[PDB]
Design a protein around this motif. Structure first.
Motif, PDB file in Angstrom:
ATOM      1  N   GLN A 117       0.906  -1.050   0.000  1.00 24.12           N
ATOM      2  CA  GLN A 117      -0.088   0.025   0.085  1.00 24.12           C
ATOM      3  C   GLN A 117       1.013   1.081  -0.091  1.00 24.12           C
ATOM      4  OE1 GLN A 117      -3.801  -0.318   0.126  1.00 24.12           O
ATOM      5  NE2 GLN A 117      -2.629  -1.666  -1.097  1.00 24.12           N
ATOM      6  N   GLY A 118       0.351   2.257  -0.697  1.00 25.99           N
ATOM      7  CA  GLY A 118       1.021   3.514  -0.779  1.00 25.99           C
ATOM      8  C   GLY A 118       0.954   3.949  -2.277  1.00 25.99           C
ATOM      9  N   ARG A 119       0.218   5.192  -2.473  1.00 30.11           N
ATOM     10  CA  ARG A 119       0.144   5.935  -3.600  1.00 30.11           C
ATOM     11  C   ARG A 119       1.583   6.398  -3.952  1.00 30.11           C
ATOM     12  NH1 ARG A 119      -3.141   8.449  -0.891  1.00 30.11           N
ATOM     13  NH2 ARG A 119      -2.353  10.411  -1.164  1.00 30.11           N
TER      14      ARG A 119
END
Ligand SMILES: Nc1nc2c(ncn2[C@@H]2O[C@H](COP(=O)(O)OP(=O)(O)OP(=O)(O)O)[C@@H](O)[C@H]2O)c(=O)[nH]1
Ligand SMILES: [Mg+2]
Lengths: 151, 99, 292, 387, 49, 49
Positions: free
Chosen positions: A143-145
């Motif tokens: 997860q993580g943009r």
């Protein structure tokens, strides 16, 4: 197919540690399986598994559905832009019963034959030279943009 | 068509397998003929080869197409699922009658 | 007894090796000219051949005169032979291996238990040398001593298809052989070979030494290659013909790759598993002798 | 109480019936999650495949319906020779000879059941054909000479399926960027001399290659075909071509697949133009000439089966697995059993071996005693001689 | 009549398909067939429905 | 009924994929033996948790 894929993960990780040169307590120099008789899809798995593609080191493949990723990867290799990699993958697919391995593996196998002269290990084996690739793919699974700063 | 390809593909099954013969003898006999240049479309022609018959083979690809279509036909009732495969068998028999 | 010349027995016109071709008795070399090779993506690399076992199988007490040449040539190139290990008469070669045995190996290719009249036979010393290696055909089947039947064919390829540069390198691309051909060509070739008196070739291969031996290997290389060819068609994964403008090119694929096939086919002779073990062993011994 | 006599007695009866000659199929793998019977079919390229396993729904006298209820008597009202032990029935070890002879009779019967059909089909196996135009690329070309072409429909109807049978890569498309060497590589990779046309003008070295090597281009359609070639010679023309049938024997040549020796060809020339009807009739006649020997159990299995065979096409019939999706698979050297690669016209090895010798007999000049043509001429017969 | 393979007409699962074919399978009548073949080449005056 | 809903939402069948992953139908269809030769298997016997 699931068995072969789990073993390809194992040999890829182990080879990833040997390539970094760190000492490893590996159970055997080539952790992955050799089909003796199998469907086309397994022969593909053995071929890309033997290739030690840069894509694993780069984390380009998604491991959530590992075998599928490997099938698609074998697809890209089956008609790779690089003639070396394509002809090498194809050769690995045509003779899947042979165990392809890098020369650095083979020297380990030789050391093992030296230490235990009567050891059994798979006789049918080819020592291909690995093909370098300059393209360092960025990756980060989980997860993580990514917050790009465009030039 | 941009996305109706299966429809056009089924429609090509209806294309006639004969040839457009001009009415040569009728013209020579000066028989009546409302057309400027007389001709009729014969449904099929004599087989050329010793064994294969082009018409029968066309029917073979027709029922192969129809079998693929019957096969891809989703159904919900169990008896529908049954007659799907029975339909497939029966097409496969019609082909032999035709040949 | 037939004296062995300074050259091998093969130098005698009596032991000519010649396949039928174009209506004439062509020599194998001039058939192998017809052979042409399509290299493919795969690569054959020749492994070191394991040394053949020291052990010579017991020649069981056999009263009869065992027709050995027929047994061997049928086991390697016979159209219909099978279960070539159930009988185990190849062990009989070992009877000749002893110094000063009463047994003699006839030009007929039969192993007589005693010297007998009006039957010409090879000089017992030479045959002793030949038996000392080829009796081991007798343990082709025995589990402890079976030859590799996959790797060995690489050598076959190299010795058949391989260009002098490839033979020097010890590695050649896997090749797909072809030649302009007559109907049923591989069968008729295989039978012209089956009729060959190969015991001459082997006895010269084992008895000769020094320059005279090496001159043999060059003189007989194409013969050996023909045996290798029949054998390679026996294990070739497939064997098609190609139309080539009112001509036909037989194409066997692939040289040097044992497909391990056992189901028969009209195109070529076929090895039952026993014949595979046997041919493997024969190749192991003959190649071991061909390089020294 | 019952299982003590199930695991220890019936299991060796399964273990023994597992070995019977006619129990050829695998029945289970133990994994309910993934097991599915291998689905072989008798594909005919000039026909539709007959699956071996089918829900044909014929009940074989009720055999295909399953009462699960039967487990209750097994658990309850049934006794076993081991369960009884306190009397000790001696176990019965049946003579092998009954089921062995019954199996032999079945095998021997169906082994020769197919022979006339198989022989005739062996003869006509090359006889399938495609209409093909032959355009003439240069001046003073005989109508045989020049580029050879056929519609995609014919290739799809004939050449393709046989390529799947022969297990070769599909032939390359040619875009006019095609060097002759790429074409040669395709004709080598798939030994049939065939390449599919795709798009664009085809350059002249490629045209001379396709012409010199009789390679068959497969045009999608015949509309303005000369636009598709670099007719730099300006000899090739849209109306200058020759239609002709081309036998499959004239393109394929695989010895256990398609009989193609000149004797059988010389035979086919003599054949009147045929039909599946005429062929079925021929087969029936050969069948009634050779009234095959059969044991009484074989006569029984014959009448049990027990009638028509004619519905199946058999022209170059092969045995191949189909995907459950229904597509017909190529022979896998690693999965399908070796014997299935070529039904050698469904004939014994010995019949093929003799067959070659007979082809030598048929082709022999001394038996070519049916003479063609005659010359009327009004001469004296002064010194007669037939020659 | 040769409408069905043996013995799918006997088969229970096929009853819907069999009724479907018997729904369409006209009994052969010579005059009707001759009429069909003939109509193929005869001129049409009233537009056929 | 609840577990039945959770199970049957996944589908009453599945197909093993060319990659070997299971692919459940997502639909509650009644099974027919015509499917036995089809790519599908009954979902109860998938042994997938
Ligand atoms: N080794 C290898 N061969 C392939 C691969 N994909 C296709 N082929 C070759 O192509 C033949 C069949 O092609 P396709 O039917 O298009 O392959 P596919 O099963 O549909 O798989 P996809 O290419 O992913 O669509 C096979 O016999 C292979 O020899 C691959 O990924 N690896
Ligand atoms: Mg482990």
């Amino acid at each position: 197919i699931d068995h072969f894929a789990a073993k390809i993960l194992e040999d890829w990780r182990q080879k990833e540690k040997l390539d970094k040169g760190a000492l490893v307590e590996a159970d055997r120099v080539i952790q992955r399986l050799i089909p003796l008789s199998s469907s086309t899809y397994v022969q593909r798995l053995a071929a890309i598994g033997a290739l030690y593609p840069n894509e694993f080191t780069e984390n380009v493949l998604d491991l959530s559905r590992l075998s599928t990723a490997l099938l698609q990867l074998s697809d890209t290799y089956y008609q790779h832009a690089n003639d070396q990699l394509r002809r090498l993958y194809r050769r690995m697919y045509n003779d899947s019963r042979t165990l392809y391995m890098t020369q650095r593996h083979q020297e380990l196998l030789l050391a093992q034959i030296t230490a235990d002269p009567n050891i059994l290990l798979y006789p049918y084996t080819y020592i291909f030279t690995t093909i370098p690739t300059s393209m360092n793919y960025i990756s980060n699974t989980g997860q993580g943009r990514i917050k790009h700063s465009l030039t | 068509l941009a996305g109706a390809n299966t429809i056009i593909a089924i429609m090509r099954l209806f294309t006639p397998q004969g040839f457009l013969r001009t009415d040569d003898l009728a013209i020579a006999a000066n028989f009546p003929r409302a057309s400027r240049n007389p001709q009729t479309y014969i449904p099929y022609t004599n087989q050329r080869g010793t064994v294969t018959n082009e018409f029968a083979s066309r029917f073979r690809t027709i029922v192969a197409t129809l079998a693929n279509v019957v096969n891809e036909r989703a159904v919900q009732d169990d008896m529908q699922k049954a007659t799907r495969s029975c339909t497939k068998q029966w097409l496969r028999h019609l082909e032999t009658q035709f040949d | 007894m037939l004296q062995q010349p300074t050259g091998g027995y093969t130098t005698l016109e009596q032991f000519a090796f010649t396949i039928r071709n174009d209506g004439t008795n062509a020599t194998p070399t001039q058939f192998l000219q017809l052979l042409s090779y399509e290299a493919t993506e795969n690569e054959l690399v020749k492994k070191t051949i394991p040394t053949p076992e020291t052990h010579l199988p017991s020649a069981r007490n056999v009263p009869g005169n065992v027709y050995i040449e027929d047994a061997i040539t049928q086991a390697l190139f016979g159209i219909s032979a099978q279960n070539v290990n159930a009988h185990g008469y190849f062990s009989r070669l070992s009877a000749l291996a002893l110094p000063n045995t009463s047994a003699r190996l006839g030009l007929d290719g039969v192993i007589y238990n005693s010297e007998t009249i009006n039957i010409p036979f090879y000089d017992p010393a030479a045959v002793a040398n030949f038996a000392a290696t080829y009796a081991k055909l007798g343990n082709a089947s025995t589990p402890r001593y079976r030859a590799d039947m996959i790797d060995i064919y690489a050598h076959v390829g190299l010795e058949l298809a391989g260009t002098d540069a490839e033979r020097a390198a010890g590695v050649m691309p896997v090749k797909r052989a072809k030649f302009d051909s007559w109907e049923g060509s591989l069968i008729s070739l295989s039978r012209d070979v089956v009729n060959w008196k190969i015991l001459a070739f082997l006895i010269d291969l084992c008895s000769l030494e020094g320059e005279a031996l090496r001159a043999f290997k060059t003189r007989n290389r194409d013969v050996f290659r023909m045996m290798l060819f029949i054998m390679s068609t026996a294990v070739a994964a497939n064997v098609v013909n190609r139309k080539v403008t009112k001509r036909v090119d037989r194409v066997l694929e692939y040289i040097g790759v044992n497909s391990m096939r056992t189901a028969g086919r009209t195109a070529t002779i076929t090895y039952d598993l026993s014949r595979h073990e046997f041919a493997a062993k024969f190749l192991q011994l003959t190649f071991t002798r061909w390089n020294a | 109480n019952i299982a003590v006599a199930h695991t220890d007695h019936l299991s060796v009866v399964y273990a023994t019936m597992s070995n019977f000659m006619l129990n050829f199929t695998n029945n289970f793998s133990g994994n309910h999650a993934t097991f599915k019977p291998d689905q072989y079919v008798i594909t005919s390229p000039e026909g539709s495949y007959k699956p071996i396993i089918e829900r044909q729904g014929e009940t074989v006298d009720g055999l295909t319906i399953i009462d699960t209820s039967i487990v209750w008597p097994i658990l309850c009202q049934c006794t076993y020779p081991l369960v009884r032990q306190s009397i000790m029935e001696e176990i019965v070890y049946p003579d092998p000879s009954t089921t062995l002879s019954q199996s032999l009779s079945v095998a021997q019967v169906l082994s020769k059941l197919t022979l006339p059909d198989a022989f005739i089909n062996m003869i006509l196996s090359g006889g399938d054909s495609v209409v093909m135009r032959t355009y003439q690329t240069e001046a003073d070309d005989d109508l045989d000479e020049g580029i050879r072409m056929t519609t995609y429909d014919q290739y799809l109807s004939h050449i393709r399926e046989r390529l799947h049978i022969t297990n070769v890569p599909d032939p390359i498309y040619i875009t006019g960027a095609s060097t002759p060497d790429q074409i040669a590589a395709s004709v080598q990779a798939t030994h049939v001399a065939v390449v599919l046309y795709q798009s664009g003008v085809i350059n002249g070295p490629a045209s001379t290659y396709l012409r010199e090597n009789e390679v068959l281009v497969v045009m999608p359609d015949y509309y303005d075909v000369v636009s598709r070639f670099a007719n730099a010679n300006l000899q090739m023309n849209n109306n200058r071509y020759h239609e002709s049938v081309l036998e499959i024997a004239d393109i394929f040549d695989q010895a256990d697949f398609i009989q193609t020796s000149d004797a059988v060809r010389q035979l086919r020339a003599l054949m009147p133009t045929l039909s599946t009807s005429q062929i079925r009739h021929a087969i029936e006649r050969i069948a009634q000439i050779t009234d095959v020997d059969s044991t009484d159990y074989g006569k029984l299995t014959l009448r049990f089966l027990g009638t028509l065979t004619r519905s199946l096409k058999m022209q170059n019939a092969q045995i191949r697995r189909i995907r459950p999706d229904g597509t017909v698979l190529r022979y896998d050297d690693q999965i399908d059993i070796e014997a299935f690669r070529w039904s050698r016209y469904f004939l014994d090895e010995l019949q093929l071996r003799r067959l070659s010798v007979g082809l030598r007999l048929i082709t022999n000049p001394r038996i070519a005693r049916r003479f063609n043509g005659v010359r009327i001429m009004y001469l004296t017969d002064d010194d007669p001689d037939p020659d | 009549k040769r409408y069905f393979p043996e013995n799918l007409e006997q088969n229970q699962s096929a009853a819907r398909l069999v009724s479907a074919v018997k729904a369409r399978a006209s009994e052969a009548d010579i005059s009707s067939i001759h009429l069909a073949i003939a109509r193929e080449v005869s001129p049409m005056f009233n537009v056929h429905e | 009924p609840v577990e039945y809903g959770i199970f049957v939402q996944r589908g009453a069948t599945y197909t093993i994929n060319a990659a070997g992953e299971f692919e459940f139908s997502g639909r509650n269809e009644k099974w027919d033996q015509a499917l036995y030769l089809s790519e599908h298997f009954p979902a109860l016997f998938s042994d997938v948790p």
